[PDB]
Every structure is written in C-alpha cells, then in structure tokens.
Write a protein that binds this ligand. Structure first.
Ligand SMILES: [Cl-]
Ligand SMILES: [Cl-]
Ligand SMILES: [Cl-]
Ligand SMILES: [Mg+2]
Length: 431
C-alpha cells in the first residue's frame, strides 16, 4: 500500500454510479473538448460526457500552465479525482500528472465506452447545439468528400476570416478555403452589420447561398494593442463575428471550427498557401435578414434595460468597464452603459480568455453557464450581448446559442454607438 505514480486504482461502474452526486468527487473527462460537447468521435451512439463531469483534455498535458488550468477549474488535492476517456490507457498520463502535483486520491474509470455510453440508464450530458461547433476531423472529412456525422448537405464552403489581413490567409490556410475580410460584412463607419443589399452582394461574390453550409475559422496571431489594427491578429473572434452576421442574414447552416486554425494544425492536417479564387454564385436564395431577432439595435437595447425579462450583457474588459481605457485606439470616450450586466471577456478588446481555453477552443460550457447564472444571466431572459463594436459580443452570443438558449441576441452598436450620442447616459469608475 504505497502511492504509485504509474499504477492507478480502477473504480468500478457501480462505485462511480453511487458517487455521481458527491460534492467531494471530481469526474474528469480527458477526451477532446469536441467529444465532451457531444461529438461521437468513435461512433458511440450516445455522445457527450458523464453527467457532472468536467473537461480536461489530455492534449493539454504539454501546456506548461497545466497545473494553473487545473486550479482555476477548482480541482483540488482534497477532492477525489475520477478520470475517464475512451479507454483507460488514455487516462494514464493524466493520472500520473495529478499524482506528481500532490493529488493523492486519483482513480481511473475503465468502462465509459462502450459500457456507460451504451446504456441509457447511465446519465450523460452534452452541449445542446454541439453540431454547430465542429472539430478539425469533421472539416477534413467535409473537404475530402467522406461521410461525416451531422451533415446532410451537398454544398459547402470553408471560409478563413480576417480583418484587412490577407497575409493571415496567405501564410497558411485549410486546403481549398477562401478568405473573407470582415469588412465585407460589416461597415467601417458604424462597425455594425452592413445593409441587406450589401450582405446579399458580398455573400454572393464570396460564393455563399442561404443553403450553403459555411464553415468559418480564423487564425490567432497574438493581437498587440501597440499595433494600429490588433483585430488583424484576432482572426477567430472575427470568424465568430462573421458567423453571427451570416446567421442573422440567413445562411441556414453555419459551423465554426472549434479553436480555429490552431485546431487544424494541432490535428496534423495539411495546410495550403494557394490564393484560391472565388467561385461566385448569382443568387443568395432567401430574404435578408432571415433571422433579424439575432440583432438588437440601440432603441431596443434601451427598452431591454427597462424590461424585467431582458438584459444587456457587457462583454468588455475590466479596464474598459470602469472607464480606465476605451479599449480601442479609434474610440476616445470612456465609460459603460448603465444597467448592463458585466460578463468580463478577458484581458482586452481582442482576447477572450474567460470564454476560451489556452488552445482557443470554447471554455467548458458548464463553467460559462454557472458564472453567468451568478450574475442573473439565464436562458429565461432575452439577452443582448455586446462589447465595443460587437466582436466579443458575438462570441459570447455564440456560446449561449450553442447551449440552446431560446432568446439571445447581439446588441450590435455596443459602446461605440452608445457613446457616439452625447445625450446617452454613461457611468464611470469602480461600481
Ligand atoms: Cl441553431
Ligand atoms: Cl482570435
Ligand atoms: Cl459598457
Ligand atoms: Mg457593431
């Protein structure tokens, strides 16, 4: 009876079942986040995670901040740790890593697949709209013409988003993908979505119809506030921003590659440097916008601040929230919209650390859900997420949409439109 860094105790199905409600037990899913979200990556008939399990992909073992990731997930040495993957062998390195860092109660559950996934009495959970947030393997099957799950279409396009930075695309992109400048779908004057006529033309010239499956992704290139356009380096926020606008416009099937370009190269797939010409289409095929409820403008937003069942969700940084900085080099006004609920995005206007993992995949949705709930951000309300100009609001909105929330919007104008009217009230300083 000694602590063994390399030999791990197995916990049986019956023991684990009896512990599903224990507050002192942490069930840890070491598969990829996409499998955790619900993708049936090994052909299992029930996808998702053991009910109550947290997500800690073994892929993160090479991250030097691994222990800080564990600690901010509130996984503590006094907890009983139960690990599972598709196989117990996939858990061994994670089990050892926990034991090397002072975690003495670590078990491996051997029978998640196919035992747990294959019996409907064993409770599981999943991200309700997981099929909109696709893994790299799905994209690779799509462009290769292979059969893939959650796809019944015959027309697709892979779109590499960027803000006036074609080099983000030309320096390496998914084979066959074409680039879309974010300026194609949003106006540099208002930083809102363009008019219906402009959206129709822009989508057609990029080869997109309403019945085209659009797969969006961007390249993270370490945004720097010292640069004139830091957004040129936050390509995957821009991709989700464009996903919002396309879904607003009326593209029926929009997917986002979870984690963006890094997920493609982390999977080891081939990259291309061809400047792929556009294959235009003549008619978009649906009235624009087909889903106008996704977009909230300033008059409705003011109404939502007065309504009991509605709220605006400020997805800005803390220095922006208290009026220390405006967040952007082209905005002078500092302050915040009075009455909005704060949901801190991350470090600045071009980072989403509170909504992402280190590899830029979306944060474990239960964590987003629970933090939001502590502030009264809940699905029974009509929610309009916003930020400076709508990029971060769109990513927060997308995370809520993935959870299946029935009334979530982006207040497009954000602080930029709000503060451009001097008659609009604003707060400043620490609350
Ligand atoms: Cl949907
Ligand atoms: Cl990004
Ligand atoms: Cl604000
Ligand atoms: Mg805007």
């Amino acid at each position: 009876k000694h602590k063994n860094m390399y030999d791990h105790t197995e916990i049986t199905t019956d023991s684990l079942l009896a512990l599903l409600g224990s507050e002192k037990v942490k069930i840890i899913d070491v598969r990829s986040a996409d499998a955790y979200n619900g993708w049936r990556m090994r052909g299992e008939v029930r996808g998702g995670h053991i009910k109550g399990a947290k997500s800690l992909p073994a892929k993160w073992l090479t991250d030097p901040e691994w222990l800080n990731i564990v600690r901010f997930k509130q996984i503590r040495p006094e907890d009983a740790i139960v690990l599972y993957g598709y196989t117990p062998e996939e858990c061994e390195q994670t089990a050892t890593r926990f034991k090397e860092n002072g975690y003495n109660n670590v078990s491996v559950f051997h029978r998640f697949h196919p035992d747990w996934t294959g019996n409907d009495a064993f409770p599981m959970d999943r991200l309700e709209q997981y099929n909109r947030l696709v893994p790299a393997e799905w994209v690779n099957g799509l462009i290769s013409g292979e059969e893939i799950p959650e796809y019944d279409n015959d027309t697709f396009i892979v779109c590499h988003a960027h803000y006036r930075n074609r080099d983000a695309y030309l320096s390496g992109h998914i084979p066959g993908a074409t680039d879309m400048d974010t300026l194609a779908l949003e106006s540099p004057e208002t930083w809102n979505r363009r008019t219906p006529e402009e959206l129709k033309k822009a989508l057609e010239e990029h080869g997109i119809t309403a019945s085209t499956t659009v797969v969006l992704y961007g390249k993270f290139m370490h945004p720097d506030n010292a640069d004139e356009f830091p957004g040129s380096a936050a390509g995957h926020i821009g991709a989700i921003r464009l996903a919002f606008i396309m879904m607003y416009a009326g593209v029926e099937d929009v997917r986002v590659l979870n984690g963006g370009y890094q997920s493609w190269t982390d999977a080891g797939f081939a990259i291309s440097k061809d400047d792929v010409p556009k294959t235009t289409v003549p008619e978009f095929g649906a009235p624009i916008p087909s889903r106008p409820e996704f977009a909230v403008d300033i008059d409705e937003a003011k109404e939502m601040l007065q309504s009991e069942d509605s709220d605006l969700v400020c997805v800005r940084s803390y220095p922006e929230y208290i009026g220390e900085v405006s967040g952007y080099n082209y905005i002078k006004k500092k302050g915040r919209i009075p009455g909005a609920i704060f949901a801190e995005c991350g470090s600045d206007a071009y980072h989403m650390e509170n909504y992402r993992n280190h590899d830029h995949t979306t944060r474990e949705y239960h964590e987003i859900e629970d933090i939001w709930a502590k502030s009264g951000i809940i699905p029974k309300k009509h929610l309009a997420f916003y930020c400076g100009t709508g990029w971060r609001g769109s990513e927060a909105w997308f995370n809520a949409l993935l959870m299946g929330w029935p009334r979530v919007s982006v207040y497009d104008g954000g602080w930029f439109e709000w503060s451009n009217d001097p008659e609009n009230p604003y707060e400043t300083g620490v609350p």
